[PDB]
Amino acid sequence: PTIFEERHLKYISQLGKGNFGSVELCRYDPLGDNTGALVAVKQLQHSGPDQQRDFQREIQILKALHSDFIVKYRGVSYGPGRQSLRLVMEYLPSGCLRDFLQRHRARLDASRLLLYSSQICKGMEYLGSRRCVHRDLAARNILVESEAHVKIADFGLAKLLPLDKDYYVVREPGQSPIFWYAPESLSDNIFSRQSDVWSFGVVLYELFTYCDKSCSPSAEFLRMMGVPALSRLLELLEEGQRLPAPPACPAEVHELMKLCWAPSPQDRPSFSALGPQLDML
Numbered sequence: 001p002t003i004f005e006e007r008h009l010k011y012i013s014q015l016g017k018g019n020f021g022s023v024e025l026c027r028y029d030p031l032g033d034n035t036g037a038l039v040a041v042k043q044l045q046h047s048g049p050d051q052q053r054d055f056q057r058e059i060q061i062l063k064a065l066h067s068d069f070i071v072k073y074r075g076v077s078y079g080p081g082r083q084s085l086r087l088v089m090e091y092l093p094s095g096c097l098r099d100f101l102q103r104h105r106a107r108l109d110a111s112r113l114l115l116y117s118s119q120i121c122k123g124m125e126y127l128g129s130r131r132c133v134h135r136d137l138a139a140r141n142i143l144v145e146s147e148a149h150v151k152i153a154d155f156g157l158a159k160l161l162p163l164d165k166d167y168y169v170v171r172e173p174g175q176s177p178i179f180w181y182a183p184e185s186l187s188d189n190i191f192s193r194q195s196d197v198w199s200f201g202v203v204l205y206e207l208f209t210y211c212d213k214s215c216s217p218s219a220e221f222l223r224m225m226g227v228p229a230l231s232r233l234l235e236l237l238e239e240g241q242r243l244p245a246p247p248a249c250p251a252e253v254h255e256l257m258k259l260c261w262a263p264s265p266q267d268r269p270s271f272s273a274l275g276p277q278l279d280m281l
């Protein structure tokens with residue numbers, strides 16, 4: 001049931017890509033008549049041992065996650081051995097939240113944005129409870145199930161925290177747009193559930209700008225900046241500068257963003273603390 005046969009997965013189109021992987025829309029069509037169910041199918045773009053190890057980890061993480069706010073694992077297809085070839089997931093045709101917000105901005109009010117914020121927060125609370133650090137939380141990595149329901153996706157950079165250690169250090173600097181990283185990630189490559197909280201603050205920013213490109217984290221931080229861009233961004237953050245409140249943003253929401261962006265990770269609120277506050281608003 002959770003093993004999909006290669007010959008039955010029929011290629012339709014590209015959905016996305018990033019971090020050495022692609023996600024394709026396929027029909028799982030064992031009858032061959034174009035009547036089968038649609039699925040979203042992730043694979044490496046090309047072979048590589050480091051990326052294969054990371055891919056198997058992604059599969060193992062997602063398979064063990066069971067939440068209305070996390071994209072559903074369906075199964076896998078295999079290459080040669082037990083070598084995983086594809087990760088099969090539910091297909092959410094509304095696509096990523098970034099795209100959805102841009103398209104439907106004139107239809108989604110502040111209550112809707114708060115609903116999405118609450119749902120994302122609940123998914124992240126759950127992730128934290130599984131000792132999972134996502135590391136790449138952004139609107140482009142969140143999917144839309146319906147106009148009243150979003151789900152976190154993109155577990156390709158996620159890591160599980162050992163039982164005796166609440167952070168991890170990466171050896172190389174990351175390769176995602178720098179404007180979602182916490183200061184400690186920028187300076188020391190440290191990631192934690194608390195750096196996910198920082199990124200969630202940027203996600204709240206994105207929600208309340210409807211992912212408008214002109215005031216996006218990149219556009220606005222670059223404009224505020226004026227050494228290497230990473231060192232410049234780090235300086236800016238260490239001085240206390242932050243993204244400005246989005247146009248028409250409710251003050252209470254902006255205040256929560258600022259808490260998420262506390263300089264020190266131990267001073268940021270937990271997702272468990274943020275949830276009830278979002279629900280209140």
Ligand SMILES: CC(C)(C)c1nc2c3ccc(F)cc3c3c(=O)[nH]ccc3c2[nH]1
Pocket residue numbers: 015016017018023040071089090091092093094095096140141143153154
């Ligand atoms: C590249 C990235 C990992 C963010 C990703 N993009 C998508 C995606 C994009 C458009 C769309 F209509 C659907 C999806 C999608 C999906 O439907 N399921 C699972 C992952 C996934 C996805 N995963």
